[model samples]
Target chain A: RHVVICGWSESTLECLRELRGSEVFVLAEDENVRKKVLRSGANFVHGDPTRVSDLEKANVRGARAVIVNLESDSETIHCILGIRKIDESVRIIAEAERYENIEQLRMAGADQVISPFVISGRLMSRSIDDGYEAMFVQDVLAEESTRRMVEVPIPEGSKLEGVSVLDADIHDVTGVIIIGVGRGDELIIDPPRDYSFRAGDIILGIGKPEEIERLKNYISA
Target chain B: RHVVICGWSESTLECLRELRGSEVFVLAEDENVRKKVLRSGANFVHGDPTRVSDLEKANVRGARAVIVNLESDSETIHCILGIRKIDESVRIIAEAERYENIEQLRMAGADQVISPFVISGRLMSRSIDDGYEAMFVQDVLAEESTRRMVEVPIPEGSKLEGVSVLDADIHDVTGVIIIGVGRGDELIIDPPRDYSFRAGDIILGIGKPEEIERLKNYISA
Candidate 1:
């Protein structure tokens, strides 16, 4: 239910391609972005982001969120300002191509300012480190979730010793879906029934991510 | 058809207003967000965000994802963490009041984190620095939807409770078919069991535009 915005450049076309399966509203005065939006199978609105009328037609008012992927600072600002004027509650995530402008993009009204190069580079590096087989790097960062899943490694003096899976009642703090368990030199994709998580074993349970974090805290404590 | 998250003090209230008429779920811990959400006629979940039970009832399981609209970094982190645990697959968009904590948010497992003040300032200032705005925000235009689907949440005291899906009279309204209903923790996707709609369950139906909307409003009301 969210969408991406990009400057009318070589990258916008690719952005549109990625957005093909979902809703994409593309606005570009530079025929490039406009054509990209249309070709990529998105709703194409042609105009500058600064104009109030253009913003209205873009339905910035009704959009769940807007990705200010534009290259121009003024237009991004104008659009953010216009969006703020129209509806201040919409979440706006922006791209700052230039590291120097990251602060400015944040100032103009971007909720999240992403440096594609830095992030992409970091991702690319991770891929290379993982032998480039992985395409995306998703690390849990500052999550606020009630039910979570975490892979916990059992340590000495842990409460989990001799605990039967059925008796564990991992669902106490959150719902439990045991995706897997990792034992010494053997990764159990799906652990069998009556399994007892021994010390040095890793238990993967699903619930609130934070609660999962809490479980980790309990074991560590 | 849409939902809005409201709070005058959010500094982003105007943004949420822009997304009116869309299926919006408002997350407001205070009266301010509640008033705005009520005015927009969206489904509101009232609870302390730090607590997980309230967020669970907000339909987090079936939600495509969640947008964390809380004002503070701590609250946003807590909410996001809670949401991620509920549905590890769900995507989260978080808000931050300060820029320095961006990395901390990333560490906390937020899919996306935004700081409004910094982005707005940059966008506004960037315009003065740069001459033009960017192009193509969201290009997902509404297609001529011949096939439509609507989600219906079975309320706590609805008569539909315990009624078999076949007897729900859903088809009579618009040739609609009961595609699925989320009962408790299990999603009855094409449920083979001759199931009944339980309180707090969500039923998804497919039918004509007017027909489905009518059923949705009726069921929701």
Candidate 2:
């Protein structure tokens, strides 16, 4: 399926790299930008994306997707309108500079609209919400995937402390694999059998969520 | 549910603001920070979060969640281990300073691990992909909630062009509500019925995705 890209920006460049297999036509108003896209082995058309004539030149009607990464929210909306005139079914994704504009861009016939700040801000907040256990991870664990990664610590006075990895038999005990040991700032992957667990040693393992839960209970017991 | 916040930072402040309804105990090693939390009308405890004794003083075992927002990944991991010793079920959310340390922190018994750069970088890349029509929006729309906001434009030479809002009958045609109009840089909310649809006008609307699809087809038709 064909894809139409409007404007030239870092985001657009990244998108282009991933969309290499697809037939792509880049629409730009600037002569230099048109030349650069052409040099990069992409089909380029010089035109103002706000104008339907320009989009028609790019064959927007045949495209499966049209991405509007324009200079401003106003320009992006106009670009979407121009493409929608030709193809109402083409998936249009537009760049939003402000959080408030995301809904507006979506309403403008953009199948999706994204703002970097909104995503980054929400993620940053989630990262700080739990003890490195974001609700995001809980959501991931809820996916019903068979395998899950988890960290269990060698609690104070635990039977595993001072015991070697080989003797501990974590796999036998919890049906989980001990992939690494978190010691201070270092993560010892596939640690030696003789490596003993200290009071603060954290065992990094992977298994079913239920198994991980069992191991956590056993380790803390 | 009670939440124990370890360390003090801007991220912690935002967490505190959002967790206003929850019983929050801010654990700070510094006396001044403790005083500040007290002044904010929230509970505060003075202690090194890496030490079980300090965490015990903060009643970490009873908390429904433990957010480790320590100064560094090292301190955060240590704090997580300390908490696991106290309560295995209490959710542990830890902050990571480096991307490489996310798995390590997760293995160290952090139920969730997050790094600022990792979240921001991934979002930045996604925003650039697919002509800005990122799969991110798909995820947002995935929630069963039917109502979604969208922006649609009045395309050139459309039947609706030069027609007033009252005459357009957008709701009758598409089962969507026109909430606003994007005129240049201005967003006119609840635009008057007399508001005319010009060639470049972007219509901001809210409704179900299916309804929006109908509206897009109607506007572009």
Candidate 3:
């Protein structure tokens, strides 16, 4: 299972911080990205991801999914095409700069193409209406019920792993909501409260800022 | 089906121009882009695409596709959720500045999300390689091909529309290679020369600078 991600940027770094807890090999090319990935504690190779040789060095053959977190729409297309040329089974997520490039990214073989600017716009617009339904919007307003996008890794011996969502004490320990879960090959949305957390699961919770922070510390510890 | 695309970055502007040729209502909040849209002789309404009221003013209800192309990732996500809240069948395409924000974009219900920078870097690497392969990369790349990706729109009234690719004579007359075809939502690669073309069909072709220049004149005039 390989995930072919496009580029190395701030977003890529954020993704890696969460993704490193999973089973995917996040391949990046930028020198700065490589250094940052090493510093941020992610498994990555420093080389041109669009090139077949570099991808091979990244072990693309063994990857189950690919994320094209690139800045350029054209390069994302090329990266997707290049990876598809080698392995069509690898799941691809492309990064597009404009909404117009979506069709091109799909045509190039990206299972999913993401645009950061557009999403941010959407978030900003909704935040205006939801009136703080999303807690990560500001600088942690120090509210107990305020939310924090906590990235928690499933530990090797944690009691949470292999336990269904319904069995987990998510409601008891912290008044947080498990909004999303990143598995090795699949990303689960609003997973059932009883859903079992796996060894490589990265759980994102929304809850009181302090509770969310506590959850993060607990998961990592 | 009509697609209402928002925003006016160079990439988004190029997307709008492309959409206009195909009859998509390319909307822009940027006053400058709105003027350009008016000058281009296309149907456009100037207003903030992220605002529900502005989208209403632009007749978003009639649009079959919606692409949020703001430069900021947060804004895109907010707009996407709004689109989802208002119209589910509108097929939303979101653009982001960062790849890490994709999960949020997806959660916000963006059908597709993209990052221009990552795609640009990767495509730049390919263009550099193509510079060695075909000696035409310099002429073809316009802020990365992902933005103004050398396309030929066959308007509904074109004499070439519905004609077989083989009979089109595009290659012979302009030395252009038919790289791909974009028909509404589908993107076809290496389309058979005898494949019939149609109005609203977009042809992605590779040509030398002179050849591309000739073909544009021949097709438009």
Candidate 4:
């Protein structure tokens, strides 16, 4: 129900924005970082992030997850060690200073160790290697979540029966493409334009959220 | 063209995997890092990452992009300065030690400054707040790289015409996510909640799936 943060930085701000539905607490000793954390509507616990006492005060034992972002990779590892003593089940995600430090950080007690530079480098590499592919990657990775996937069944005795994939004019009518047609347990992917619809078939499509909303009703009806 | 890398770490290896098909050069002074870079099929340039002479050896002037991953903040900034001196048009994507350094790195010439920790934090935050949604996030972020968006015109005189994207729900009818509505030359990425359909508009949808092979072809169409 609640999430805990070990140390704070610009990343914490974005994390808080995404964790709006859950209660969040951040451990930091500085006035500036604390104030910023408080401004983000998260509780700012006073004391060292690597200290067990401070974690207890923040009730890390009851937290759903803890994010570790210290100034140094060594500090992050130490913090992870202390957090583990307080609670073993809580998920710990720590940031590392270098990609090489990932295994070491994981060995120290972090459930996940991420190297920001490496991740950034990987993303940029995708872009540099191929620009068109990069744009597709953007659609999948973008924060706004501009797309979604959903599936619905074509009920037995429905009016859409015997309709050709193209003749149904799903794309022309609703602005949605039929990516796959589910026939019972089997899925017909990249359904040909001339494919015929059968009762008990399932439709999988991707579109704008609202259009999908419309699509849901259109399928059920 | 070739891609240039500044500094070396475990991240460099993974970056190479994504940058396949492009020539790559890495700048590192250490024998260990250089040996590893050469093993990765990327050229190893021996010299300081921050020196203009070293960058010239890597031919940063002709490179498609440069990825900077130095050991220290000072070292990374200095290296960025040199890359900028050689070529301002070439993209510079650098990793930062802290989110606090992102702005400064960008000011120095990095087109994109990523704090992996922050990205990691943001990712875990989404997970910690909502597990179900995180499952879907994993679907979109799947490394398989199968899902894609495609546009197909809605036919005139179809069953889907004249319905609100909400009521006529295409996802319910077909398994897909419509990211946008193509109307004439303009693309409507974010449809109004109350918006309905026009027959002439094109459907832009992400295909929905092995429950993903179907998913791959589902959106790929």
Per-model i-RMS:
19.7, 17.6, 17.2, 6.9
Ranking by lDDT: 4, 2, 3, 1
lDDT of 1 by residue, A104-199 (tens): 777867765544333322222122112111110121111232332345677977887777765665534333444456664244433334788778
Tell me model 4's lDDT, rounded to 2 decimals: 0.67
Cα misplacement distance, residue B9 of candidate 3 (Å): 5.4
- Stretch of 10 with least lDDT, candidate 2 chain A: A130-139
Better of 2 and 4 by DockQ: 4
Give the per-residue lDDT digits (tens) of candidate 2, residues A1-221: 77788887645654565456667899988787766576555789988889999889988886776778787888888888778878898777676766557778888898666554343333434443222222332222222445544557788988777788878766656756565676543555445557888888877665667778778777763
Q: Largest DockQ belongs to which candidate?
A: 4
TM-score of chain A of 4: 0.65
Write the residue-wise lDDT of candidate 4 on B95-204 in tens digits: 77666787889899887655554565565564452232223332333345455344556566655567787776555456565556656424555455467777667665
User: lDDT score of model 1?
Assistant: 0.52
Model 2: per-residue lDDT, tens digit, B50-70? Answer: 999999998988677787878
TM-score between predicted and true chain B, model 2:
0.57
Give the per-residue lDDT of model 1 (tens digit) for B145-202: 3443345677777777777765665544444455455543344443333677777786
How many pairs collide in each candidate, listed in order? 84, 19, 76, 41
Structural similarity to truth (TM-score) of each candidate: 0.31, 0.36, 0.38, 0.58
Top candidate, metric lDDT = 4
Across the candidates, what are chain A's individual TM-scores? 0.53, 0.56, 0.58, 0.65
Model 3: per-residue lDDT, tens digit, A1-221?
43444566655654554444455455766666566666645566777777888877777776655667665787777787888888886666556677678789989886655554443343322221121211222212112323333446777767676778767756345645554566553444444435777777877554556666667655543
After superposing candidate 2, which stretches have Cα over 4 Å from the reference? A1-221, B31-41, B129-221
- Winning model by TM-score: 4
